[PDB]
Every structure is written in structure tokens, then in C-alpha cells.
């Protein structure tokens with residue numbers, strides 16, 4: 001599913017990501033834009049052989065099981081395909097675990113390079129939240 005910007009903002013808010021671990025909702029919408037263009041089906045292979053899945057490009061080296069990343073953890077205890085659903089619950093629940101691990105949203109390289117330090121509130125401007 002390719003979410004609309006406000007559509008994804010409302011879904012994230014309803015799932016309690018807004019202000020989670022101190023990250024206002026625009027941070028999550030900005031990260032999702034650059035990680036996946038709001039497309040739940042996005043997948044990308046990493047150089048180490050792991051793959052990133054879903055709206056927040058959650059990786060199989062640590063967080064989900066895709067059956068092909070040797071030496072892996074599955075810290076969210078889910079198949080990586082659950083992160084590609086039109087229902088973003090699994091992506092949100094797993095993102096909450098990732099952002100609570102010590103490095104905050106710096107775990108998402110695209111958030112650090114393209115959202116951190118920018119006016120991230122602009123990502124939810126005009127949305128009826």
C-alpha cells in the first residue's frame with residue numbers, strides 16, 4: 001500500500017508513535033518518506049546481505065526474520081514480510097523497539113541525514129490530526 005502523507009501521519013498517531021521516545025510525529029513521517037516513499041511494500045538489500053523492509057525499512061540483520069540473513073537476530077519476533085502489510089501495526093511496534101535501543105532515531109541513517117535538524121513539523125502540515 002502506498003499511503004498518503006496525512007493518511008500515514010494519522011495511522012502513526014493512532015498507533016502511538018507521535019512523540020514516542022520524544023520524537024514528534026513529523027520525524028516519523030519524514031523518515032518514512034525517505035525510507036520508502038510511504039510504500040509498505042518497499043524492500044532493499046544491504047551490502048551485508050541483510051534486507052530492509054516496509055515503510056521504515058526495518059532490517060533483517062537484527063529485527064525480523066527473512067530466512068536468508070545468516071547470523072541474524074529477530075528482535076521484533078516477526079517474519080520480515082509482516083512489515084510489508086497494508087496494516088502498519090507490525091512496523092510501528094518494531095520501530096518502537098528500535099528507537100528504544102539507545103541510539104534513538106539515529107538508527108535510521110535516512111532520518112539522520114535528511115530529517116534530523118530540519119523543520120520536521122512541515123511533514124504533518126495541513127493534516128487533520
Ligand SMILES: [Cl-]
Pocket residue numbers: 024025026027120121122124
Ligand atoms: Cl512534528
Ligand SMILES: [Cl-]
Pocket residue numbers: 021022103104105
Ligand atoms: Cl533520543
